[PDB]
Design a protein around this ligand. Structure first.
Ligand SMILES: CC(C)(COP(=O)(O)OP(=O)(O)OC[C@H]1O[C@@H](n2cnc3c(N)ncnc32)[C@H](O)[C@@H]1OP(=O)(O)O)[C@@H](O)C(=O)NCCC(=O)NCCS
Ligand SMILES: CC(C)(COP(=O)(O)OP(=O)(O)OC[C@H]1O[C@@H](n2cnc3c(N)ncnc32)[C@H](O)[C@@H]1OP(=O)(O)O)[C@@H](O)C(=O)NCCC(=O)NCCS
Lengths: 129, 134, 129, 130
């Protein structure tokens, strides 16, 4: 199921190349994942107060086309695969003209911070997705 | 393909950390960018200068594999090789190790040479090809 | 007239202390100024074609209380001063409980982005302010 | 005593205007303070042993001239004042030609990471600096 999250491009996100810095896309993707979780009632640091957190294990990003200042982007997020301790988010970004700017596949592993050891996924999250 | 490994040190500062107590995963991406830039600089090329010559380098595809976390005040070494080279693009193989030489993570980066103000692929400058010819 | 802009704290804005990095606040302030100008139909990628920009000349931030991950903040922004070439933004950040986290006074100069020289303010900006 | 710290400008620090994003300077200044303390063996490790953290109370930055991609800058840092639970950093940034790009005055409060209330400056710190 698809979750959509709007993102405005600000000066902070751009570089001297006249486009969005390639790492800023990575941050945009994280917000989208965060907001999708929130859409299913989750708060990631009150959730780390119960010592459960999410870390990125692997990420593959393809940049097809650039975003620019004040572009209103849409980040699209899906959970495509689920295992015992990890999640696979399939994500993509489009602009106002529905041009496909880029897309990412993010392997996220459920850990808990003070150990950051792979912990089994919370039972509630399994029920949701 | 000039195989020689280029090494670049990076100190982890507060700005690179998150509430999790480790380095933010996008900061690794910037660290990789810095090392590629320094590798180019070591071979006598400035991207600021190349910009006005209508030459820029943009990331087309990037794969990052996070094995182990970096923390505040760690002194890291970014390692950078060019493994593939084509007309308008080339492939970087990079990885990050800490002081104990623990492999923190590694990346493969596809960089494309473009004309920044029209954002279309262009042949790598001959002098850059010359430096990484072999 | 006061202008309000909501901002969500994400992982990207936090540091190892578990609170928002103080430079992230600076970025938040910039967003609000941009959105404030936008609200008066003053977009800045549109005007860079027009070779006109707003660069920060002086910024003073005073910090009182911290913000944490997933906090929904509010940036309050008002223009308090104006001269032929410059203008002053008075800004502050509060949290959901209306606690004052910090405040900033930002001096901004209108310049040409080519040689970066001080130009006089567009008579339309001084009009709607 | 003046402490110098080099900082290279990268793409990450720049914006679409072709110059360094004004917030990137704030981070540069912190690195320099961090490195200044490190020079006197006051590493984060040393601070945690004192259970001491440093937070910014007030900061005034003055932007005079822009830095650009590939500029090698120098951050110049000095402690100009020290009081009970705080101390004032005076910082400047110059380029390779020693042109003054911008400067900052940073009031830093000595806090306690438990809680972050004012804590008296460590004896070693007040003795290390004058
Ligand atoms: C690098 C770049 C110029 C390569 O141009 P290219 O020769 O068209 O390369 P590709 O064909 O492999 O691009 C893949 C697809 O994106 C399309 N594309 C390229 N530039 C585009 C643009 N400006 N707008 C919309 N689509 C674009 C391509 O047509 C292609 O379509 P298809 O595979 O579905 O048929 C282009 O992909 C690009 O601008 N990527 C974004 C770079 C970036 O911003 N990186 C982050 C900052 S470093
Ligand atoms: C996510 C993580 C807990 C995976 O758990 P895992 O049990 O090690 O599972 P994996 O099989 O994927 O391990 C991958 C490799 O990383 C190594 N590794 C994991 N944690 C390590 C550590 N703390 N120190 C050194 N190596 C470590 C593993 O040994 C493994 O290498 P190997 O083939 O020699 O065994 C761990 O790899 C990790 O912490 N990665 C970094 C996460 C991160 O910092 N992301 C950025 C912030 S979100």
């Amino acid at each position: 199921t698809l979750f959509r999250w709007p993102v405005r491009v600000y000066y902070e996100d751009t570089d001297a190349g006249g486009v969005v810095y390639h790492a800023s896309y990575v941050a945009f993707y994280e917000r989208a994942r965060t907001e999708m979780l929130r859409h299913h009632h989750f708060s990631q640091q009150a959730l780390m107060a119960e010592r459960v957190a999410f870390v990125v294990r692997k990420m593959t990003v393809e940049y097809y086309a650039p975003a620019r200042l004040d572009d209103m982007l849409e980040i699209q997020t899906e959970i495509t695969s689920m295992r015992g301790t990890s999640l696979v988010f399939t994500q993509r970004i489009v602009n106002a003209e529905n041009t496909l700017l880029n897309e990412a596949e993010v392997l996220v592993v459920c850990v808990d911070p003070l150990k950051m050891k792979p912990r089994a996924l919370p039972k509630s999250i399994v029920a949701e997705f």
